[PDB]
Structure 1
Amino acid sequence: APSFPFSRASGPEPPAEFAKLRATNPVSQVKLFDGSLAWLVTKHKDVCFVATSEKLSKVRTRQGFPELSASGKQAAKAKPTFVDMDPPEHMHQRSMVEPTFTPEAVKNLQPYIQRTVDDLLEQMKQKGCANGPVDLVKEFALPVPSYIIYTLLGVPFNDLEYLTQQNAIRTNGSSTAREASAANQELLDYLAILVEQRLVEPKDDIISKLCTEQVKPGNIDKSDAVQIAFLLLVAGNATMVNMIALGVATLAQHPDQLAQLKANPSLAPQFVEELCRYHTATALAIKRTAKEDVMIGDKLVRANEGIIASNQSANRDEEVFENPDEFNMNRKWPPQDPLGFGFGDHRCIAEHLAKAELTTVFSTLYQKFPDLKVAVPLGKINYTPLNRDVGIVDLPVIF
Structure 2
Amino acid sequence: GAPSFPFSRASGPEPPAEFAKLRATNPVSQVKLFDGSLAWLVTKHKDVCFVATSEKLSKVRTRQGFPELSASGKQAAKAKPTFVDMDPPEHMHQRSMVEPTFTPEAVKNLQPYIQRTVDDLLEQMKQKGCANGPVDLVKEFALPVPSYIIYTLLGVPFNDLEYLTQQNAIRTNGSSTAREASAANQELLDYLAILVEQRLVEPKDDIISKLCTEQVKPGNIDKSDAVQIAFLLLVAGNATMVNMIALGVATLAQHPDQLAQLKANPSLAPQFVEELCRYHTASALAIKRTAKEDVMIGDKLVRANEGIIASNQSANRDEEVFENPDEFNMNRKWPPQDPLGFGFGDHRCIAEHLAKAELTTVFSTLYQKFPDLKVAVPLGKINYTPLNRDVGIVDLPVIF
Q: TM-score range by the shorter chain?
A: over 0.9
Instruction: Give the corresponding residue for 2:132.
Output: 131
1:253 Cα offset (Å): 0.2
- 2:259 counterpart SS class: helix
- 1:390 counterpart SS class: coil
* Deviation sequence 1:109-163 (CA, Å, 0-9, x none): 0110000000000011112111111100000000000000000000001100100
1:82 Cα offset (Å): 0.2
1:185 Cα offset (Å): 1.1
Instruction: Give the corresponding residue for 1:91.
Output: 92
1:312 Cα offset (Å): 0.1
In structure 2, distance between residues paired with 1:75 and 1:130: 45
1:217 Cα offset (Å): 0.2
* Deviation sequence 1:230-285 (CA, Å, 0-9, x none): 00000000000000000000000000000000111101000000000000000000
1:144-293 aligned at under 5 Å gives the runs 144-293=145-294
In structure 1, distance between residues paired with 2:46 and 2:312: 10
* Deviation sequence 1:273-318 (CA, Å, 0-9, x none): 0000000000000000000000100101000000000000000000
Instruction: Give the corresponding residue for 2:314.
Output: 313
- 1:363 counterpart SS class: helix
- 1:100 counterpart SS class: helix
Instruction: Give the corresponding residue for 1:6.
Output: 7
1:180 Cα offset (Å): 1.0
- 2:31 counterpart SS class: strand
* Deviation sequence 1:9-59 (CA, Å, 0-9, x none): 000010010000000000000000011000000000000000000000000
In structure 2, distance between residues paired with 1:87 and 1:356: 29
1:182 Cα offset (Å): 1.1
In structure 2, distance between residues paired with 1:58 and 1:335: 28
1:176 Cα offset (Å): 1.2
1:104 Cα offset (Å): 0.5
* Deviation sequence 1:318-341 (CA, Å, 0-9, x none): 000000000001111000000000
In structure 2, distance between residues paired with 1:239 and 1:331: 24
In structure 1, distance between residues paired with 2:379 and 2:101: 38
* Deviation sequence 1:181-208 (CA, Å, 0-9, x none): 1111110000000000000000000000
- 1:345 counterpart SS class: helix
In structure 2, distance between residues paired with 1:99 and 1:222: 20
1:365 Cα offset (Å): 0.1
- 1:225 counterpart SS class: helix
- 1:235 counterpart SS class: helix
- 1:204 counterpart SS class: coil
In structure 2, distance between residues paired with 1:177 and 1:30: 29
In structure 1, distance between residues paired with 2:83 and 2:329: 35
| TM-score normalised by L of structure 2 | 0.99
RMSD over aligned CA atoms reads 0.4
In structure 2, distance between residues paired with 1:254 and 1:115: 28
In structure 2, distance between residues paired with 1:185 and 1:127: 31
Unmatched segments (≥5 aa) in structure 1: none
Instruction: Give the corresponding residue for 1:62.
Output: 63
- 1:365 counterpart SS class: helix
Aligned length: 399
In structure 2, distance between residues paired with 1:321 and 1:178: 44
- 1:163 counterpart SS class: helix
- 1:238 counterpart SS class: helix
In structure 2, distance between residues paired with 1:225 and 1:208: 10
1:178 Cα offset (Å): 1.4
Instruction: Give the corresponding residue for 1:142.
Output: 143
1:165 Cα offset (Å): 0.3
In structure 2, distance between residues paired with 1:20 and 1:98: 38
1:179 Cα offset (Å): 1.1
1:229 Cα offset (Å): 0.2
Deviant stretches of 4+, over 3 Å: none
In structure 2, distance between residues paired with 1:210 and 1:321: 41
- 1:386 counterpart SS class: coil
1:379 Cα offset (Å): 0.4
Instruction: Give the corresponding residue for 1:35.
Output: 36
- 2:345 counterpart SS class: coil
In structure 2, distance between residues paired with 1:222 and 1:128: 43
* Deviation sequence 1:362-386 (CA, Å, 0-9, x none): 0000000000000100000000011
In structure 2, distance between residues paired with 1:327 and 1:81: 36
| TM-score normalised by L of structure 1 | 1.00
In structure 2, distance between residues paired with 1:217 and 1:84: 24
In structure 1, distance between residues paired with 2:187 and 2:26: 45
In structure 2, distance between residues paired with 1:291 and 1:394: 42
In structure 2, distance between residues paired with 1:184 and 1:217: 29
In structure 2, distance between residues paired with 1:281 and 1:174: 20
In structure 2, distance between residues paired with 1:340 and 1:156: 31
* Deviation sequence 1:376-397 (CA, Å, 0-9, x none): 0000000001111000000000
